[PDB]
């Protein structure tokens, strides 16, 4: 057919050259050619068409003066050539060879027929992806954006993609060309809202700065309005993070490369709200709350928001760590306003101080320290009075990290030394400038002892290891703008757009091991030179002596009221508070702990006495203890010397090894094994490399002769050895590692076994043990969890989590494992959840990232999660799911529910399975829960089990709880949205039972009754009335109640008690029997099988990191977000419009008026599960939308109903008119849905 069709192909190409003498047949020639090339492949196309003659003819048509007014032909020619080089990429340059780009500019110069222009712009844009500079070479590319406001959408955004692609390959000689287009891109960037339009106008602006920062007259390009919109583009939440970082990249270069507008960024624009609103987008409560917000902020934005604020300020007096040179930055004699210029700093310091506090990345701390000693040198005595407090504690926290510096060898790590040197320099500057202001607070918080200890440490560190062993104290300021262009990167298939050259700013100087000590010794000597210079401390000592005195009464509550009465007045002065150092200096924490952990008084009385005195200053007491724990914290955060940072690229790592069995295969074999998987999976890797005795070879991994079990990871014990050795971890990636070692998949059994023999790691916390003890006592008082989260420990844990190699190494620091289980109140809920998934879900559910490409391409082969369809019947949903556990209970497969003889699948049936099954677990007929009992079948009240009947058979109630355990455990491992209704007490009995060496039921009894009225207030008040008058035997016998279980009078408390009545003789036994029955021995038999089934999927021991009141919410108690503002922020809208739309305002106004049942009915229909996912509508993937719905055929949309394309996730809303009909329609839908 090709030969027959050639006589029509070549004829049509000839007609294109005949368009001069045939203006109209060429129309259908081009139409016929363009139609076919779009419906065929290039490889047939490439062998037939003379592309060069094609484009020559097309240029002849587009440039002929005869055919200028053939607007119905020029469109077709442009479309035909566009489809010509859409299919053949190499034909793009062929057109460029004959000045097609200049020809196509001429059309856009003057148009009266836009359908040609929306084709010309759509076509020439596709050129800019390959030949971005060829378009830039012509240099009049402001033409493309003059007709912006006439292009509908696609041309409107393709008239920007071309400029951006031509604005990315810019060089030094194209300075004037950008000035040509800048006035025509400035306002349309100032008034744009579409994201594929604001993601190109920032790439173009980044490409401009990548090349033109050295070219002169660069100050006049980015004028005030443009930099102002760049500033305010961060203060809006809808901007993504990826563009958010780029905007700061342009903005910091515009302050580094020049000074004129770098002055503007501090005089005219506001930088404080600039920093604040970018952080608060990640906040959770609108009444924030700076301290907790910074925990959730990504590290990538923390780096940029700091490396921009350091650049905005001119360098410091002594440049130990900063490496800048720029000439025009010695003009800090300009102090005209102590408000317009200094209200920036006096509230910026309380921003980046917290940035330092709640972040632990090396780059972030370095940047923020540089910024501190850069900006504090600018303030004066008058300005410094209001910044005294935070800096003192910050520097105290900086240079108290001395203990981490020492190695297991006794050697040193330069990372901590740089931080110490920076903190010491900041201390030197502040003591040199504000001695009178800083003498009291430094002494009070105790920094002088710290700097003395650091002086001793610096002296003790060895020096003679120098290779260049000729070192003078003056090796100063080597290269400090030889280091902003040295690594600027940027010096075939077609991409979406031309990515601008990645600029890499360098403001750091790497310090040598000798230089850090040389600076540190002089700095400590200086600060000690300036080191030269209340009874409340003696009152603290007196309080310590009083607590240490056993002669003080400590038995009745009247004693403990006075125990804390003196303490409250000792610690909290009317002016200031006792610092975190003074509290732990005189042993006051030890004095509190000894009295708390020795007194025989029940915890209830202690908590009551504490709450009766510390009524309103609970957080004031929490902050002092948190500061004390932060300073006394000594745990060294581990690292593995990654060469790929904290990303999936660090998952793609492999190490050459020479495994040695502690022929030559077991002694010398160089193979690059991944550093991710386990020793079970190390056995798997050696099984793979064997390709069978090597399969059987289960090894006792004596790396450095250590009998460690099979549970660790491929480099787990190796890394543990290189921690006890504490060698150079960077060499570990270059060392051919001498690995020393000696000798049910049906589900299959998951490799969650990293912590079978690690959960009992009882690590000593040092002097912080008292602090942790009374913090755990305070959280046991049931007080709110406002300030229980420790900022820096949470930051350290988060920095541990975003090191994928160590987290997947199974060698997580034992202090973290101990602290999470033992003190789960020091960390945020999100951090604890992330810890739970990584420590609990196995490598298959860990290395598969969800930690936001080819980095995981080699890892997804061995770390993917597998689907598993499950087929059941709707009428047998409960009973079949029972056998589903017996067959597929502990599988690692994500559950997928399918209903037989039905086609509709997906997450719908999966959500509908366990949601219905959970309600089937709320049936009175199963005899599983306290169904009051004093109509239907379902329990509508709070849910809690009933005691067994010892005489009656109970083979089914226990088994049902055993199944419920595996259901509930399976729910959390898969992030399923369940609606189940548990009681807070039910999980208290589960945390206490699974905690070793503690009674499940509290030995205290009035604690037990107080824990009882959360289950049944009638019995609670009956029992506390029994306790109240246990001496009035006349009233005790008035009840005349025998030893039968209340409510279920068929069960005897004690043998023969059904005859004996209630009196003062054995009232205590009656109380301890009814308690033991309703809460304890009568109900523990359910729990012992519930945990038995819970631990089949994964052990309940991991779950102890959470809280019962934070488990009911995740299991289906949490109240959902339904406020006016919080919902349309989760809308995305589009297509009409959202504006106004008068159908959206009322549609959001009705959804707020729903009761508790309308919400459930609407959610089980919109989603499939009757409740909302975790954390609001944000977790819905994708977000729920609003889409226009037209009127068909002629009847109004005020009669129809909200449509869904059966993939929602979203809705399509018809044009309703009246409010009342909207209320009728939406309700009729939600109730008729169920």
């Amino acid at each position: 057919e090709s030969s027959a069709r050639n006589e029509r192909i070549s004829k049509l190409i000839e007609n294109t050259g005949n368009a001069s003498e045939d203006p109209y047949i060429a129309m259908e020639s081009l139409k016929e050619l363009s139609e076919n090339i779009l419906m065929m492949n290039q490889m047939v196309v490439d062998r037939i068409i003379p592309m060069e003659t094609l484009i020559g003819n097309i240029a002849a048509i587009l440039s002929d003066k005869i055919l200028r007014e053939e607007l119905e032909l020029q469109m077709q020619a442009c479309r035909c050539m566009y489809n010509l080089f859409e299919v053949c990429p190499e034909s793009i340059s062929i057109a460029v060879d004959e000045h097609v780009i200049p020809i196509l500019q001429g059309k856009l110069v003057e148009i009266s027929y836009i359908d040609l222009a929306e084709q010309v712009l759509e076509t020439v844009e596709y050129i800019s992806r390959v030949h971005g500079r060829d378009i830039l070479k012509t240099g009049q590319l402001s033409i493309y954006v003059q007709f912006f406001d006439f292009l509908t959408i696609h041309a409107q955004r393709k008239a920007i993609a071309i400029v951006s692609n031509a604005c990315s390959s810019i060089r030094t000689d194209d300075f004037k060309t950008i000035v040509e287009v800048l006035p025509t891109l400035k306002p349309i960037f100032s008034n744009a809202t579409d994201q594929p339009i604001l993601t190109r106008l920032v790439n173009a602006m980044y490409g401009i700065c990548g090349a033109l920062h050295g070219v002169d007259k660069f100050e006049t390009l980015f004028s005030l309005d443009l930099i102002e919109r760049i500033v305010q583009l961060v203060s809006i939440q809808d901007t993504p993070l990826e563009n958010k970082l780029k905007c700061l990249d342009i903005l910091t270069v515009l302050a580094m490369s020049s000074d004129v507008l770098s002055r503007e960024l501090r005089e005219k624009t506001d930088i404080v709200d600039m920093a604040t609103r970018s952080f608060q987008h990640y906040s959770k409560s609108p009444n924030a709350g700076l301290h907790e917000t910074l925990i959730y902020v990504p590290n990538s934005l923390l780096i940029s928001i700091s490396r921009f604020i350091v650049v905005l300020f001119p360098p410091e007096d002594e440049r130990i760590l900063s490496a800048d040179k720029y000439t025009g930055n010695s003009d800090r004699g300009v102090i005209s306003n102590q408000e317009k210029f200094d209200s920036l700093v006096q509230c910026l310091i309380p921003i980046l101080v917290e940035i330092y506090t709640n972040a632990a990345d090396f780059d972030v701390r370095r940047y923020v320290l540089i910024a501190l000693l850069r900006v504090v040198s600018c303030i004066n005595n008058s300005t410094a009075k209001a910044i005294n407090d935070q800096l003192i504690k910050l520097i105290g926290s900086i240079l108290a990290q001395k203990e981490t510096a020492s190695n297991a060898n006794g050697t040193y790590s330069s990372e901590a030394g740089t931080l110490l040197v920076g903190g010491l320099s900041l201390l030197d500057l502040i003591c040199k400038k504000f001695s009178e202001l800083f003498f009291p607070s430094i002494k009070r918080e105790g920094i002088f002892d710290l700097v003395k200890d650091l002086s001793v440490d610096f002296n003790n560190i060895d020096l003679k290891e120098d290779g260049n062993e000729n070192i003078s104290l003056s090796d100063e300021e080597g290269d400090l703008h030889s280091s902003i262009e040295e690594c600027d990167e940027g010096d075939m298939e077609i991409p979406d757009s031309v990515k601008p050259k990645k600029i890499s700013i360098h403001i750091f100087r790497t310090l040598s091991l000798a230089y850090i000590k040389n600076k540190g010794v002089n700095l400590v000597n200086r600060v000690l030179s300036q080191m030269n210079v209340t009874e409340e401390l003696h009152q603290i000592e007196g309080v310590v002596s009083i607590l240490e005195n056993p002669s003080t009464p400590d038995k009745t509550e009247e004693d403990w009221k006075g125990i804390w009465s003196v303490l409250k007045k000792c610690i909290f002065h009317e002016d200031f508070d006792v610092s975190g150092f003074e509290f732990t200096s005189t042993g006051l924490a030890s004095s509190i702990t000894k009295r708390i952990t020795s007194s025989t008084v029940s915890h209830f009385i202690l908590a009551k006495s504490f709450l009766e005195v510390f009524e309103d200053c609970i957080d004031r007491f929490l902050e002092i203890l948190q500061s004390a724990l932060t300073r006394l914290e000594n745990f060294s955060i581990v690292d593995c010397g990654l060469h790929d940072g904290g990303g999936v690229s660090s998952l793609a790592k492999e190490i050459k090894i020479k495994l040695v069995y502690d022929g030559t295969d077991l002694s010398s074999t160089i193979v690059s094994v991944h550093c991710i998987a386990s020793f079970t999976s190390l056995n798997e890797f050696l099984r793979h490399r064997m390709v069978d005795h090597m399969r059987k070879k289960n090894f006792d991994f004596f790396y450095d002769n250590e009998k460690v079990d099979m549970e660790s990871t491929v480099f787990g014990v190796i890394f543990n050895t290189f921690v006890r050795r504490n060698r150079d971890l960077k060499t570990l990636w270059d060392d051919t590692h001498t690995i020393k070692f000696c000798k049910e998949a049906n589900e299959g059994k998951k490799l969650r076994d990293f912590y079978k023999k690690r959960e009992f790691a009882q690590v000593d916390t040092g002097s912080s043990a008292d602090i942790l003890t009374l913090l755990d006592f305070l959280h046991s008082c049931g007080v709110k969890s406002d300030s229980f989260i420790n900022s820096k420990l949470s930051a350290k844990l988060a920095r541990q989590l975003d090191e994928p190699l160590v987290v997947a190494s199974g060698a997580l620091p034992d202090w973290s494992l101990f602290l999470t289980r033992r003190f789960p109140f020091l960390f945020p809920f999100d951090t604890r959840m992330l810890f739970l998934q990584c420590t609990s879900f196995g490598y298959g559910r860990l290395i598969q990232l969800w930690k936001n490409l080819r980095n995981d391409e080699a890892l997804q082969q061995l770390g993917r999660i597998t689907r598993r369809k499950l087929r059941i019947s709707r009428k047998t949903i409960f009973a079949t799911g029972l056998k589903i556990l017996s067959k597929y209970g502990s599988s690692p497969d994500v559950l997928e529910i399918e209903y037989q003889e039905e086609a509709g699948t997906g997450l719908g049936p999966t959500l509908e399975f366990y949601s219905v099954v959970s309600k089937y677990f709320a049936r009175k007929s199963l005899n599983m829960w306290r169904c009051n009992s004093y109509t239907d079948d379902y329990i509508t009240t709070l849910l809690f089990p009933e005691p067994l009947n010892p005489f009656s058979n109970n083979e089914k109630v226990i088994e049902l709880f055993g199944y419920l355990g595996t259901f509930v455990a399976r729910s959390l491992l898969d992030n399923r949205i369940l609606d189940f209704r548990f009681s807070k007490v039910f999980f208290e009995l589960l945390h206490r039972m699974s905690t070793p060496n503690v009674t499940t039921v509290p030995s205290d009894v009035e604690t037990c009754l107080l824990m009882i009225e959360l289950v049944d207030p009638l019995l609670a008040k009956s029992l506390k009335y029994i306790v109240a008058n246990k001496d009035d035997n006349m009233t005790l016998e008035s009840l005349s109640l025998t030893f039968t279980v209340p409510g279920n009078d068929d069960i005897e408390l004690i043998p023969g008690g059904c005859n004996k009545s209630l009196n003062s003789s054995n009232v205590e036994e009656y109380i301890h029997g009814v308690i033991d029955q309703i809460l304890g021995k009568g109900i523990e038999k359910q729990l012992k099988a519930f945990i038995e089934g819970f631990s089949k999927v994964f052990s309940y021991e991991r779950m102890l990191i959470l809280f019962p009141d934070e488990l009911v919410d995740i299991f289906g108690r949490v109240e959902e977000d339904w406020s006016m503002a919080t919902l349309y922020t989760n809308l995305n809208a589009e297509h009409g419009y959202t504006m106004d739309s008068s159908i959206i305002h009322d549609f959001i106004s009705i959804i707020s008026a729903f009761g508790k049942h309308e919400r459930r009915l609407f959610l089980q229909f919109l989603t499939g599960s009757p409740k909302l996912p975790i954390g609001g509508f944000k977790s819905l993937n994708p977000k729920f939308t609003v889409v226009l719905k037209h009127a068909e055929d002629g009847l109004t949309a005020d009669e129809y109903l909200p449509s869904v394309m059966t993939c929602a996730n979203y809705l399509k809303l018809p044009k309703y008119t009246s409010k009342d009909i909207m209320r009728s329609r939406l309700c009729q839908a939600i109730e008729e849905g169920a």
């Binding site: 129809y1200 109903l1201 909200p1202 449509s1203 059966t1206």
Partner: protein
Amino acid sequence: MQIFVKTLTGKTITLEVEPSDTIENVKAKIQDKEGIPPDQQRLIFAGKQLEDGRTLSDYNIQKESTLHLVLRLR
């Protein structure tokens, strides 16, 4: 003879049917009259949802009984 079909707002349509006619024949004829496709059509009588596989006399529907019509959604 004819039966009454109530629209979702005020208006009422009356259709000439027979006891032997089916619950999908009525959907076809109401699509002929109004034009709304059956996939967005829901027939409701006496609260319970009328499955479209029976006949009009299978449910024993009265002569002038007004079964309610709902333009359903997906």
